Write a protein that holds these residues in place. Structure first.
Motif, PDB file in Angstrom:
ATOM      1  N   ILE A 133       0.822  -1.211   0.000  1.00 49.44           N
ATOM      2  CA  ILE A 133       0.000   0.000   0.000  1.00 49.44           C
ATOM      3  C   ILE A 133       0.855   1.259   0.000  1.00 49.44           C
ATOM      4  N   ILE A 134       1.859   1.269   0.868  1.00 45.27           N
ATOM      5  CA  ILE A 134       2.768   2.396   0.980  1.00 45.27           C
ATOM      6  C   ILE A 134       3.522   2.586  -0.329  1.00 45.27           C
ATOM      7  N   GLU A 135       4.204   1.541  -0.782  1.00 46.20           N
ATOM      8  CA  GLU A 135       4.937   1.619  -2.042  1.00 46.20           C
ATOM      9  C   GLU A 135       4.030   2.186  -3.130  1.00 46.20           C
ATOM     10  N   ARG A 136       2.745   1.845  -3.070  1.00 44.44           N
ATOM     11  CA  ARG A 136       1.762   2.310  -4.045  1.00 44.44           C
ATOM     12  C   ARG A 136       1.301   3.762  -3.887  1.00 44.44           C
ATOM     13  N   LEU A 137       1.470   4.348  -2.702  1.00 43.10           N
ATOM     14  CA  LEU A 137       1.069   5.744  -2.489  1.00 43.10           C
ATOM     15  C   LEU A 137       2.225   6.727  -2.488  1.00 43.10           C
ATOM     16  N   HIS A 138       3.420   6.214  -2.196  1.00 43.76           N
ATOM     17  CA  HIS A 138       4.631   7.031  -2.106  1.00 43.76           C
ATOM     18  C   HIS A 138       5.818   6.475  -2.892  1.00 43.76           C
TER      19      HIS A 138
ATOM     20  N   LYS B  41      18.219  -4.931   0.615  1.00 41.79           N
ATOM     21  CA  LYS B  41      17.922  -4.631  -0.780  1.00 41.79           C
ATOM     22  C   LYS B  41      16.663  -3.798  -1.029  1.00 41.79           C
ATOM     23  N   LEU B  42      15.496  -4.354  -0.708  1.00 42.66           N
ATOM     24  CA  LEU B  42      14.227  -3.657  -0.917  1.00 42.66           C
ATOM     25  C   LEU B  42      14.030  -3.361  -2.402  1.00 42.66           C
ATOM     26  N   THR B  43      13.152  -4.142  -3.015  1.00 43.88           N
ATOM     27  CA  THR B  43      12.854  -4.023  -4.430  1.00 43.88           C
ATOM     28  C   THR B  43      11.340  -3.975  -4.614  1.00 43.88           C
ATOM     29  N   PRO B  44      10.873  -3.716  -5.841  1.00 47.80           N
ATOM     30  CA  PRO B  44       9.426  -3.662  -6.059  1.00 47.80           C
ATOM     31  C   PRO B  44       8.698  -4.844  -5.424  1.00 47.80           C
ATOM     32  N   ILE B  45       7.422  -4.644  -5.112  1.00 50.91           N
ATOM     33  CA  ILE B  45       6.618  -5.694  -4.510  1.00 50.91           C
ATOM     34  C   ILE B  45       5.612  -6.216  -5.524  1.00 50.91           C
ATOM     35  N   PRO B  46       5.752  -7.498  -5.906  1.00 49.30           N
ATOM     36  CA  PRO B  46       4.897  -8.201  -6.870  1.00 49.30           C
ATOM     37  C   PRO B  46       3.395  -7.955  -6.721  1.00 49.30           C
ATOM     38  N   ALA B  47       2.880  -8.150  -5.510  1.00 51.00           N
ATOM     39  CA  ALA B  47       1.458  -7.958  -5.243  1.00 51.00           C
ATOM     40  C   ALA B  47       1.090  -6.490  -5.025  1.00 51.00           C
ATOM     41  N   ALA B  48       2.077  -5.602  -5.129  1.00 55.52           N
ATOM     42  CA  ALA B  48       1.836  -4.172  -4.940  1.00 55.52           C
ATOM     43  C   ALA B  48       1.108  -3.596  -6.147  1.00 55.52           C
TER      44      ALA B  48
END
Ligand SMILES: O=C(O)[C@H](Cc1ccccc1)N(Cc1ccc(-c2cc3ccccc3o2)s1)C(=O)c1ccc(Cl)cc1Cl
Length: 558
Positions: A457-462, A530-537
């Motif tokens: 959700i966060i990755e998706r808003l920011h 690392k922290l990379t894109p989230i598949p289900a994001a």
């Protein structure tokens, strides 16, 4: 005309009202100064009744009508649709006040024949009756705050059946018109990030940028019959099914303009001749009226390159500065012009030549650096209010999880990461409620959210940067720091020591939790990950999260 007329009957409380911060075993692990946090109750409703009962006076010049014309033109391109009853129902908040007619929100959402029949009959009354005032309920709002004490705000809303009706006629209007009419200036189309980027680009589009926010002294009471009617001429400019034009006219004459106020015990508290907070058109109308009054006012004061961002009753204006001495003069006129439109100032708007110095929607732009050390802008604010509430909700479960809503909207903030995420996740671990979906509110609408989802959700808003921001400015850090000393919240070092533990706790859980401690607390460790894109994001459905606000409109999604 007077904003309100009282009969003397008291605004009675529907249930038990707590004013003092409940304290439990968790309380002190967050905020130690309990005498600082309180909640507003119907006990102070009398005060509020006094602060908002006054006579409005309007002087509409040509500048006012000029802008109103432009807006009506753009409005004339909108083609809103007439929701059917089922659809309407399907937008009603699972916890929305029940109907005085034997059915509730649970009934309406499900389309029980009871609720659907009544609504069908309420809607008809709107088509053949355009005068009888529609009754309303006035209750005092319960909100938590920090001391140094404000009286409870007043919520006015029509019965559930009418609320469903409002949607059939206006849901699609209030969602569309704003964007079309005000363009980019419409603040409820931006996510916290896009809001920040809009303000930055807009600040950069000025050779000499100068900005100020404009706070209206209790904006709803300033709103006059004329505003409510002009609002309508705007709506009526849309391509609307005939039945909808009637209903919108009828809702207008019999409700939005004013009507009798009934307390929780059925007595008559008085009459309203200004904005009702509990109507579907409250946010949209305000924003519409606020934009119109501030655009006219701009011209009235000869402000060079007037650009504005308007979220309901909150206003921000960034223009082309014409000299420090010349701006302060301009703003005087502007205020005076607003005052003539029944939009006086609560506080004297004052010009700023520093972006991070303006506060809109109780927030501001600030800077930090991402994973790449690049300068990045984010939306932050004074944490006083957010924490004070996060505290209350630490010993009292509320219909509106403020701490969660806050985390989602302020993930990038120093205070939301170190304190809110830590504190609350820690509590979710112990109770094992890491996946129980909980309610919360954004720009008004109530969403259902699972804690483990936050990472996506966060990755998706920011975006991913909300996990790797650092080197927050000294201005921000010091503010977060002070507010903590004030409420008695432990220092930030203490939190990092706790996030280090909660991170470890989440990691051990593997799965979606492991992701939480992985991305949400990756700032608590030294050897970053690392922290990379989230598949289900990219799976989440966030189209309708920030298209239009519905504060006081009876709206809900997924
Ligand atoms: O870069 C910053 O602005 C803060 C500055 C700061 C200063 C004081 C309190 C909180 C934040 N900071 C810099 C530092 C991180 C860890 C530090 C540190 C030094 C140290 C020495 C002994 C024991 C523990 C220690 O932690 S300094 C961070 O790494 C940081 C970044 C984002 C978030 Cl959400 C949280 C943190 Cl901690």
């Amino acid at each position: 005309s007077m904003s309100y007329t009282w009969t003397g009957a008291l605004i009675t409380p529907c249930a038990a009202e707590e004013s003092k911060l409940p304290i439990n075993a968790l309380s002190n692990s967050l905020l130690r100064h309990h005498n600082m946090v309180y909640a507003t109750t119907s006990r102070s409703a009398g005060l509020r009744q006094k602060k908002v009962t006054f006579d409005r006076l309007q002087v509409l010049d040509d500048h006012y009508r000029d802008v109103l014309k432009e807006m009506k033109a753009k409005a004339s391109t909108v083609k809103a649709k007439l929701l059917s009853v089922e659809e309407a129902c399907k937008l009603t908040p699972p916890h929305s006040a029940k109907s005085k007619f034997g059915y509730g929100a649970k009934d309406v959402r499900n389309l029980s024949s009871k609720a659907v029949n009544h609504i069908h009959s309420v809607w008809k009354d709107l088509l053949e009756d355009t005068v009888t005032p529609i009754d309303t309920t006035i209750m005092a709002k319960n909100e938590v705050f920090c001391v140094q004490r404000k009286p409870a705000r007043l919520i006015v809303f029509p019965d559930l059946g009418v609320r469903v009706c409002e949607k059939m006629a206006l849901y699609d209007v209030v969602s569309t018109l704003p964007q079309v009419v005000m363009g980019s200036s419409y603040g409820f189309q931006y996510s916290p990030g896009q809001r920040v980027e809009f303000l930055v680009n807009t600040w950069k589009s000025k050779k000499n940028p100068m900005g100020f926010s404009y706070d209206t002294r209790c904006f709803d009471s300033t709103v006059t019959e004329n505003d409510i009617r002009v609002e309508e001429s705007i709506y009526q400019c849309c391509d609307l099914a005939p039945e909808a034009r009637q209903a919108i006219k009828s809702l207008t004459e019999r409700l939005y303009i004013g009507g009798p106020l009934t307390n929780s015990k059925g007595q008559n508290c008085g009459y309203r001749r200004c904005r009702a907070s509990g109507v579907l058109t409250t946010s949209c109308g305000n924003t519409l009226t606020c934009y119109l009054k501030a655009s006219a006012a701009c011209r009235a004061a000869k402000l060079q390159d007037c650009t504005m961002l308007v979220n309901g009753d909150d206003l921000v204006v960034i223009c082309e500065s014409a000299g420090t001495q010349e701006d302060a003069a301009s703003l005087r006129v502007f205020t005076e012009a607003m005052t003539r439109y029944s939009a006086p100032p609560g506080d004297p708007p004052q010009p700023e030549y520093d972006l991070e110095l303006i506060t809109s929607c109780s927030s501001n732009v600030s800077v930090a650096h991402d994973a790449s050390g690049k300068r990045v802008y984010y939306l932050t604010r004074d944490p006083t209010t957010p924490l004070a509430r996060a505290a209350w909700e630490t010993a009292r479960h509320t219909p509106v999880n403020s701490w969660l809503g806050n985390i989602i909207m302020y993930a990038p903030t120093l205070w939301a990461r170190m304190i809110l995420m830590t504190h609350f996740f820690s509590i979710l671990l112990a109770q094992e409620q890491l996946e129980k979906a909980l309610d919360c509110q954004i720009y008004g609408a109530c969403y259902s959210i699972e804690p483990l989802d936050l990472p996506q959700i966060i990755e998706r808003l920011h975006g991913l940067s909300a996990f790797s921001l650092h080197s927050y400015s000294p201005g921000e850090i010091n503010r977060v720091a002070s507010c903590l000393r004030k409420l008695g919240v432990p220092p930030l070092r203490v939190w990092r020591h706790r996030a280090r533990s909660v991170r470890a706790r989440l990691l051990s859980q593997g799965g979606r939790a492991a992701t939480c401690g992985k991305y949400l607390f990756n700032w608590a460790v030294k050897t970053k990950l690392k922290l990379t894109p989230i598949p289900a994001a990219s799976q989440l459905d966030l189209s309708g999260w920030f298209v239009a606000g519905y504060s006081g409109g009876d709206i809900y999604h997924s």
